[PDB]
Amino acid sequence: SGFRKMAFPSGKVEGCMVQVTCGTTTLNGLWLDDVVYCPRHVICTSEDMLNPNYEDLLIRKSNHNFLVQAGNVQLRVIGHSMQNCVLKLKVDTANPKTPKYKFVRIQPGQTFSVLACYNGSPSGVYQCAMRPNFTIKGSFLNGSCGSVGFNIDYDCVSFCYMHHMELPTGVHAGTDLAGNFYGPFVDRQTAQAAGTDTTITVNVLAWLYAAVINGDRWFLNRFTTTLNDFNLVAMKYNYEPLTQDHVDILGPLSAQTGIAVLDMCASLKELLQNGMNGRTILGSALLEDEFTPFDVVRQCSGVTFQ
Amino acid sequence: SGFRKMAFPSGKVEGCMVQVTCGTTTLNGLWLDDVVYCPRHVICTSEDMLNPNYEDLLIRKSNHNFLVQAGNVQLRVIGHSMQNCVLKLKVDTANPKTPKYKFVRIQPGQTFSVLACYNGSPSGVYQCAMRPNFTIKGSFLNGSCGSVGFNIDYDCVSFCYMHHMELPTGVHAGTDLAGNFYGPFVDRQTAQAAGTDTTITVNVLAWLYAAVINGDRWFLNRFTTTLNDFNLVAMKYNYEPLTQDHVDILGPLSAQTGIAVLDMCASLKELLQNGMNGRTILGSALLEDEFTPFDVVRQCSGVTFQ
Numbered sequence: 106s107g108f109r110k111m112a113f114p115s116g117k118v119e120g121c122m123v124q125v126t127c128g129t130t131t132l133n134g135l136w137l138d139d140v141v142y143c144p145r146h147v148i149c150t151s152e153d154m155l156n157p158n159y160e161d162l163l164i165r166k167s168n169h170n171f172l173v174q175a176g177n178v179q180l181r182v183i184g185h186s187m188q189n190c191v192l193k194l195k196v197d198t199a200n201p202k203t204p205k206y207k208f209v210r211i212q213p214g215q216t217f218s219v220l221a222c223y224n225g226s227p228s229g230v231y232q233c234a235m236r237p238n239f240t241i242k243g244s245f246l247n248g249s250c251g252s253v254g255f256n257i258d259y260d261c262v263s264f265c266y267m268h269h270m271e272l273p274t275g276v277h278a279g280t281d282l283a284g285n286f287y288g289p290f291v292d293r294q295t296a297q298a299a300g301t302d303t304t305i306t307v308n309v310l311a312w313l314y315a316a317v318i319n320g321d322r323w324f325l326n327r328f329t330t331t332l333n334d335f336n337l338v339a340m341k342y343n344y345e346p347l348t349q350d351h352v353d354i355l356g357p358l359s360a361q362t363g364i365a366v367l368d369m370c371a372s373l374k375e376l377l378q379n380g381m382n383g384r385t386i387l388g389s390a391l392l393e394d395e396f397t398p399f400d401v402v403r404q405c406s407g408v409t410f411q
Numbered sequence: 412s413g414f415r416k417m418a419f420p421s422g423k424v425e426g427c428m429v430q431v432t433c434g435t436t437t438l439n440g441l442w443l444d445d446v447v448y449c450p451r452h453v454i455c456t457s458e459d460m461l462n463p464n465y466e467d468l469l470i471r472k473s474n475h476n477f478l479v480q481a482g483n484v485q486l487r488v489i490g491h492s493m494q495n496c497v498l499k500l501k502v503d504t505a506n507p508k509t510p511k512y513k514f515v516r517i518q519p520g521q522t523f524s525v526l527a528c529y530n531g532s533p534s535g536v537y538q539c540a541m542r543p544n545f546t547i548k549g550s551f552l553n554g555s556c557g558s559v560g561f562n563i564d565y566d567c568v569s570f571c572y573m574h575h576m577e578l579p580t581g582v583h584a585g586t587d588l589a590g591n592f593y594g595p596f597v598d599r600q601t602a603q604a605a606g607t608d609t610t611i612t613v614n615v616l617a618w619l620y621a622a623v624i625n626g627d628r629w630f631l632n633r634f635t636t637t638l639n640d641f642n643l644v645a646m647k648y649n650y651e652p653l654t655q656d657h658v659d660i661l662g663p664l665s666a667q668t669g670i671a672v673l674d675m676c677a678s679l680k681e682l683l684q685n686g687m688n689g690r691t692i693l694g695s696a697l698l699e700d701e702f703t704p705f706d707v708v709r710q711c712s713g714v715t716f717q
């Protein structure tokens with residue numbers, strides 16, 4: 106029993122963190138096989154950040170302008186190319202600690218773990234979600250760029266995120282590992298807004314099932330609702346529409362608890378409409394939307410990784 | 412910017428997780444050098460758990476009753492001894508992945524990271540605190556025993572916890588790595604209560620400074636308070652007494668923000684007395700006591716590990 110914001114073990118990713126240095130920019134990079142991936146604003150200076158043409162900026166660079174520490178040892182860059190907003194530095198040594206891995210581009214609502222890094226050195230690990238507005242609510246300081254987001258899938262490190270920048274509300278924007286920004290953002294230091302974010306309804310519901318699975322039941326009710334009626338009450342409270350395809354993923358949880366999905370919606374309904382009136386769910390005084398239905402099954406069932 | 416419940420990178424500890432099997436009990440163990448440490452209720456059966464005399468139970472065992480997987484490879488046990496509630500199995504192979512490490516016995520209020528494990532295989536990592544009642548609020552299923560709690564200190568894995576058991580309210584009880592229970596608990600399956608828990612005042616305050624450091628200020632006030640007066644308002648709200656020695660640790664944060672500690676107490680005061688009235692701090696609708704003053708400096712300053 107218990108239910109915590111839980112993050113994938115970070116061992117496999119740590120063994121891939123390297124320092125990448127160009128000019129007076131030092132950020133983190135991901136070394137997998139003989140390629141090191143970092144954000145391409147490692148070739149920028151400060152006056153370069155307001156409006157750069159990275160195509161230009163990078164033809165002016167040579168392999169020797171890329172200092173790569175892996176630990177105390179220096180990696181020899183032998184080639185570079187730019188794929189969207191990531192730099193792919195071909196180095197002479199392949200990484201012995203390279204895990205089975207993939208690059209995946211995740212959908213908003215899905216969670217991943219973040220290994221926060223400075224000068225190639227992990228600082229911490231935490232769990233995040235990809236907000237409906239393609240921001241992520243992270244903990245990132247200067248130098249944290251090139252820290253990655255990832256899931257694990259038994260043995261396979263599935264990379265979905267690289268950190269690029271912080272927006273003025275303190276949320277964060279980055280790219281998948283093939284370099285493409287999640288969301289309308291660019292790696293320019295020009296003003297950009299997050300876009301009003303919404304709550305991940307299907308995840309709130311799964312966390313309600315995490316609650317039931319753990320002994321918190323005070324928020325349940327005899328009432329049922331139609332998905333059609335429920336979405337009419339979720340827009341009102343800035344939740345995201347729940348699809349039948351959500352009902353299906355929420356199914357195994359539904360079946361494990363004996364609480365049909367559409368009643369867990371009728372429960373959620375009343376919760377938005379009344380609040381919690383002192384009470385907490387799973388030690389949270391808030392409806393919590395950063396747990397996917399797979400997260401809840403993971404944590405409440407005991408899936409491991411190797 | 413940002414502020415998340417952040418856990419130490421788990422790489423170094425993962426490389427120490429092994430499966431330990433005796434009879435039909437399988438739990439996790441910590442392999443460091445040529446010793447594997449696990450809970451001593453791996454020699455128990457089910458009818459053994461109600462009232463065992465582990466001294467007896469363990470003289471009846473032989474080294475060959477201890478099956479230890481490290482990965483796919485089997486460890487040869489050559490000696491065992493019982494220190495309090497931990498078993499120290501001397502194996503023939505020393506662990507190549509053994510990090511610089513220590514065993515430390517932490518005080519209530521201090522935090523540590525938990526690497527949750529099943530059959531030697533990490534499941535997740537999360538951050539915890541040692542509650543004032545020597546329980547910890549964890550996420551632990553069957554087989555999770557022998558999962559450890561730890562801090563890192565640049566390069567040194569400082570081990571402070573091994574998981575042993577769950578109490579009927581879904582909180583967790585374990586031991587330091589020299590085998591001694593945190594709290595009045597025993598590794599018997601006899602009824603035991605957690606003892607009413609209190610809030611870690613000094614940590615709530617540090618998290619308030621995390622809030623200030625991150626742009627949340629709505630809860631501040633012109634008012635000041637005396638520590639003596641403040642403790643008179645914290646007992647009322649079941650917080651723990653704040654000592655001058657807390658004021659000193661909260662000092663660097665105090666100085667970094669320009670908010671004298673005793674005003675952050677006057678802020679806390681009003682918060683307990685009024686609640687938050689819709690608002691949140693750092694995305695939490697609750698005062699959050701599982702961040703130490705060192706955690707906040709760690710996360711808000713960018714200390715790393717190697």
Ligand SMILES: *[C@H](O)[C@H](C[C@@H]1CCNC1=O)NC(=O)[C@H](CC(C)(C)C)NC(=O)[C@@H](NC(=O)OCc1ccccc1)C(C)(C)C
Nearest residue numbers: 146245246247248249250269270271273292293294295296
């Ligand atoms: C890379 O290590 C660093 C990580 C930052 C530092 C603190 N937290 C982070 O997320 N990223 C950067 O320094 C970014 C560099 C570029 C990607 C090249 C822009 N810069 C920022 O993240 C930057 N954000 C930003 O400029 O865009 C929003 C904006 C808002 C108002 C006006 C202009 C722009 C700041 C960190 C905010 C400077």
Ligand SMILES: *[C@H](O)[C@H](C[C@@H]1CCNC1=O)NC(=O)[C@H](CC(C)(C)C)NC(=O)[C@@H](NC(=O)OCc1ccccc1)C(C)(C)C
Nearest residue numbers: 452551552553554555556575576577579598599600601602
């Ligand atoms: C070891 O892997 C396992 C981890 C448990 C399983 C689910 N969550 C956990 O924390 N630990 C145990 O199975 C414990 C075995 C002993 C340490 C030998 C007792 N058992 C428990 O944790 C046990 N707790 C308990 O018996 O004490 C409280 C109690 C309350 C009422 C009446 C009697 C005792 C249970 C998990 C609750 C069975």
